[PDB]
């Protein structure tokens, strides 16, 4: 039987089959409900919209994300999305297909326990297994050593792994990701008179961020250049035909990744988080981890992010060490590819959690067999 | 029986629909309302796992998510007296609602559905599933009377007023 | 020299001298122009009317508000408003007085830039300063800790301040204020056959709302009572001698503040906005922010609003916290009182934007010496 | 003159203030920046004792911590000719700042202080100590022209974009 590697993220649901190279279905993880009163007989009959439909009809819907900060908070919507991604997108019958899921480190135990309970009771899957997102991202990169900085819509976590060993005491997490960047962009776009308050307008701002933002090599040099001429200004087209123009806001929005104090967070920037993470590893390992920085995730797709991260870490790292950022072109789908590789290995077949084991111990069993 | 159950402070606020949709042509008042109470009744992690597992089974048989599950509950509940098992299973759910810390907020939500959407249209011959939930929220049992409405037919204070626009076009 | 305080709010304009207890001039912020063709020669007609003069002759004028949602749309009208405020109500010479201004938080920066430029060129003021209305509101109440909910004619915003330190990332802003309530009442009044469409009749609806509206402690309980008897009915006399009677419209119109979805807005009610703003601050300052709610502005003069706010916040907050809502009887002029207090403090005299500074820096100086 | 002097790697990172507090109404940017500079210049243990003591004395006499000492020093920094031999120690200190391995990071910190807090306000009439520190950090003297701020009055890319909320309450 073929495994269904299904990655659930804060922003996007990446699903597919084991052994493939690319996911087959990628739709945003949103659920939409109407907010205006219908008047036409027939027509509107659905109480909820999921996936691309909720994205297409966003003019008349309120969109809620079931996942925030990588922790599921609305379980009914999550169950709805799981049903959709199995019966209407991959065209499969979960009863005859083992499934693989993903979860960020340092999550509440109840989240994973519930997830196991839902998977074995509302879907009757043959087997399941929850793997750390950063760990899977390393399988796709074809390495056994290196530190992984997986940042997407929910969290930005670092997990160093050396020679098939993960040092858990150096795992760090930060609830600063794409959604926080979108909120900051919405906050600063009001400096130019553009107001976005509704959920659909939040999606529009998110699209602007994806299509116009970039990370500056020198924040100061860039702000000075933007304030000297109009070279950095660009124009974006709203869906109703109005045109907006953004100047320094293009690179101030992703600067929050390097200066979390912009959004009022006391925590350090990602470069300093990575530097602290390696320094908690044993002194004999730091050299290999300096030279295998592997990035993966939607927030890791801002153009120029690799150069800024390399510059900052080299500023922090010792002079004699070599710093090498690895940013593969498919780092948006690194986690899914790594999951497909893991589910397709022969030795991994002894690590599934089957229904017989589930019934004996209960969801709890998931802590024992999964890292 | 279900001692040690705690709930989130305010988590059902994200389930109530807009007042507008509450006037929509095919708005399901019963199904959505049972959704609001169910999201409120979701146990918090602070509850011990043996206690939490017990309540989740109770919510899985009286306030489900799938449409067919609620449809089957609506069918066999007409002559509910033939199933004594559900009568006790429904009562133990009612006593939990009465002690909900946010009962006052949930009481207002029920009345908002009744006046705007029409949740209490039957005003005494409901499904007996919606009855206990309302009875748990407000114990006086006054929702069966029906929501009082204001009638503009009588007009004690009818005041025909010729404003700016109405004065450009009249008769006699 | 004597300082001038000018609070150019959306609906009314408050002006006076620093060190006073009350404003000396308060007139509506409306500019009116004739809409009918003149026939009698000799009396003379001005092309426009400003302030109370435009109110008296409103039967032959169209009244245009120069300020909409807190942002100055029409600048020529605002220039005429300031001309009036300086030469016909306070009877002062601008060059011989430092003037202070107010601005709603999170407004476009072009607004304050043009304000500074206009005051430093057209009127040649020796010194000026732009303050945030919530901060002045907190000065007026003699407190240094608390959360300010200033709800005026165009903007309703929250600004939490602790020990003289503000938290900008927790500041909320909602474009739901008195003018939207007036529009909603104008729409609802058509249910009883009363139709008001002209700009002059908008003012009459505003007076009805001022003199006959109140916020119900229990909305559903109040609606039932007004549908059962005629206790809540009251009658208002139109300027032409006709009489109108309004029933449950009295407490439905202000309810938009707590249920914005009535007028089609997706935002949450002002109680929920205040709770969200409090919750975004640090955990160690929430106890003090719960117990120092300060309301100010015209929209907070509906009878019973304080009790409804206290009830809603207590319903939202944890039980063990103490909720105290502070509603001073002179809260309609809290912003101006605070502005008068700030201009009369010795330490503040070093913070003026002198003409010299503006000349050297340019209208951009408003973004440095002002918050 | 200080052959063998060494420092730590990121000892000064814990002193850089938050950007939010950097806009405080009563923020004294000069004291914070000099404190950052001093903390970056603290010698390490591996430095030989005589050199370490000499450099500690130099830092103490040129960059003190007491507010009264800093004010007294700034009083006589207006005229350096009336106090000879002060430039010699000042030049000796300014020499070692350029040889700091963290020159780039320190220069970026100074640039951030300029744009956010307003470190270079006099931009040509600043005090001797701060000007010399800035000259040591950046050798081109480009901090005297100002942070080159931006004016949102050029009106270049505004469209009065009517969004969802702005569509409701609008005139003409
Ligand atoms: N090319 C891009 N540039 C900038 N941001 C992007 C890009 N592509 C995706 N994103 C952002 O990354 C976020 C999450 O992407 P992803 O890594 O798939 O999240 P998850 O890991 O939760 O599935 C989205 O919110 C999206 O806005
Ligand atoms: N007694 C009252 N009852 C209800 N609303 C009032 C009352 N007094 C004033 N208002 C409202 O306050 C608004 C203006 O108040 P104010 O805060 O001074 O506006 P601004 O801040 O724009 O000057 C008016 O639009 C009016 O509707
Ligand atoms: Mg991810
Ligand atoms: Mg005001």
Swiss-Prot record, chains A, C:
A single cellular component GO annotation: cell body
Record-linked SUPFAM superfamilies: Actin-like ATPase domain
Modified residues (Methionine (R)-sulfoxide): 40, 43
Entry-annotated residues carrying N6-methyllysine: 80
MF GO annotations: actin monomer binding; ATP binding; calcium ion binding; calcium-dependent protein binding; cytoskeletal motor activator activity; hydrolase activity; identical protein binding; magnesium ion binding
Residues annotated with N6-malonyllysine modification: 57
InterPro entries membership: Actin (IPR004000), Actin/actin-like_CS (IPR020902), Actin_CS (IPR004001), ATPase_NBD (IPR043129)
Location within or outside the cell: Cytoplasm, Cytoskeleton
Keyword hit for Hydrolase: yes
Residues bearing the modification Tele-methylhistidine: 69
EC number: 3.6.4.-
Interaction with alpha-actinin: annotated span: 106-119, 354-366
Catalytic activity: ATP + H2O = ADP + phosphate + H(+)
PTMs per UniProt: Oxidation of Met-40 and Met-43 by MICALs (MICAL1, MICAL2 or MICAL3) to form methionine sulfoxide promotes actin filament depolymerization. MICAL1 and MICAL2 produce the (R)-S-oxide form. The (R)-S-oxide form is reverted by MSRB1 and MSRB2, which promotes actin repolymerization. Can be mono-ADP-ribosylated on Arg-173 by SpvB of Salmonella spp. This modification blocks subsequent polymerization and leads to cell death.
Modified residues annotated as ADP-ribosylarginine in this record: 173
Class of this enzyme: hydrolase
Subunit structure: Polymerization of globular actin (G-actin) leads to a structural filament (F-actin) in the form of a two-stranded helix. Each actin can bind to 4 others. Interacts with alpha-actinin. Identified in a complex composed of ACTA1, COBL, GSN and TMSB4X. Interacts with TTID. Interacts (via its C-terminus) with USP25.
Other comment: In vertebrates 3 main groups of actin isoforms, alpha, beta and gamma have been identified. The alpha actins are found in muscle tissues and are a major constituent of the contractile apparatus. The beta and gamma actins coexist in most cell types as components of the cytoskeleton and as mediators of internal cell motility.
Family of the protein in this entry: Belongs to the actin family.
Protein name, as recorded: Actin, alpha skeletal muscle
From Swiss-Prot, chains B, D:
Segments for region (Actin-binding and polymerization): 1-156
Transmembrane segments: none
Cellular localization per UniProt: Secreted
The organism's place on the tree of life at top rank: Bacteria
Similarity field: Belongs to the SipA/IpaA family.
Record's function text: Actin-binding protein that interferes with host cell actin cytoskeleton. It stimulates actin polymerization and counteracts F-actin destabilizing proteins. Potentiates SipC activity; both are required for an efficient bacterial internalization. In vitro, forms a complex with host cell protein T-plastin increasing actin bundling. It inhibits ADF/cofilin-directed depolymerization both by preventing binding of ADF and cofilin and by displacing them from F-actin. Also protects F-actin from gelsolin-directed severing and reanneals gelsolin-severed F-actin fragments.
Listed name of the protein: Cell invasion protein SipA
Organism the protein comes from: Salmonella typhimurium (strain LT2 / SGSC1412 / ATCC 700720)
Gene: sipA
Coverage span on the entire protein: 514 to 685 of 685
């Amino acid at each position: 039987t073929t495994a269904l590697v299904c990655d659930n993220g804060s922003g996007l649901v990446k699903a597919g089959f084991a052994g493939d190279d690319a996911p087959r279905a990628v739709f945003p993880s949103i659920v939409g409900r109407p907010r205006h009163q219908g008047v036409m007989v027939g027509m509107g009959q659905k109480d909820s919209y999921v996936g691309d439909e909720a994205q297409s009809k966003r003019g008349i819907l309120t969109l809620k994300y079931p996942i925030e900060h990588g922790i599921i908070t609305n379980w009914d919507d999550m169950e709805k999305i799981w049903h959709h991604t199995f019966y209407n997108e991959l065209r499969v019958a979960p009863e005859e297909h083992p499934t693989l899921l993903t979860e960020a480190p340092l999550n509440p135990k109840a989240n994973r326990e519930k997830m196991t309970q839902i998977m074995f009771e509302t879907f009757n899957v043959p087997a399941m297994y929850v793997a750390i997102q950063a760990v899977l991202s390393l399988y796709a990169s074809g390495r056994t050593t290196g530190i992984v900085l997986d940042s997407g819509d929910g969290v930005t976590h670092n997990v160093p792994i050396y020679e098939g060993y993960a040092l858990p005491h150096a795992i760090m997490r930060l609830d600063l990701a794409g959604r926080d960047l979108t909120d900051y962009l919405m906050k600063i776009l009001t400096e130019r008179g553009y107001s976005f308050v509704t959920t659909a307008e939040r999606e529009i701002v998110r699209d602007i961020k994806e299509k116009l933002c970039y990370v500056a090599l020198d924040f100061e040099n860039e702000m000075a250049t933007a304030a000297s001429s109009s070279s950095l200004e660009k124009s974006y087209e709203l869906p109703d035909g109005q045109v907006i123009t953004i100047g320094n806001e293009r690179f101030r929005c992703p600067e929050t990744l390097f200066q979390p104090s912009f959004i009022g967070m006391e925590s350090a920037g990602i470069h300093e988080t990575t530097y602290n993470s390696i320094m908690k590893c044993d002194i004999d390992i730091r050299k290999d981890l300096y030279a295998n920085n592997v990035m993966s995730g939607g927030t890791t797709m801002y153009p120029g992010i690799a150069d800024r991260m390399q510059k900052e870490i080299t500023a922090l790292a010792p002079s004699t060490m070599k710093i090498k950022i690895i940013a593969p072109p498919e780092r948006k789908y690194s986690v899914w590819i790594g999951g497909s590789i893991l589910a397709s290995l022969s030795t991994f077949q002894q690590m599934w959690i089957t229904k017989q084991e589930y019934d004996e111990a209960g969801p709890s069993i998931v802590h024992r067999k999964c890292f | 029986p279900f001692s040690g159950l705690k709930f989130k402070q305010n988590s059902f606020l994200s389930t109530v629909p807009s007042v507008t949709n509450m006037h929509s042509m095919h708005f399901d008042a019963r199904e959505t309302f049972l959704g609001v109470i169910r999201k409120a009744l979701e146990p918090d992690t602070s509850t011990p796992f043996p206690v939490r597992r017990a309540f989740d089974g109770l919510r899985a048989e009286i306030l489900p998510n799938d449409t067919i599950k609620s449809a089957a509950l609506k069918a066999q509940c007409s002559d509910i007296d033939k199933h004594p098992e559900l009568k006790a299973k429904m009562e133990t759910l009612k006593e939990v609602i009465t002690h909900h810390p946010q009962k006052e907020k949930l009481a207002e939500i029920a009345l908002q559905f009744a006046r705007e959407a029409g949740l209490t249209r039957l005003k005494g011959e409901t499904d007996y599933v919606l009855s206990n939930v309302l009875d748990g929220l407000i114990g006086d049992g006054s929702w069966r009377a029906g929501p009082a409405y204001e009638s503009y037919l009588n007009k004690p204070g009818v005041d025909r007023v010729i404003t700016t626009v109405d004065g450009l076009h009249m008769q006699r």
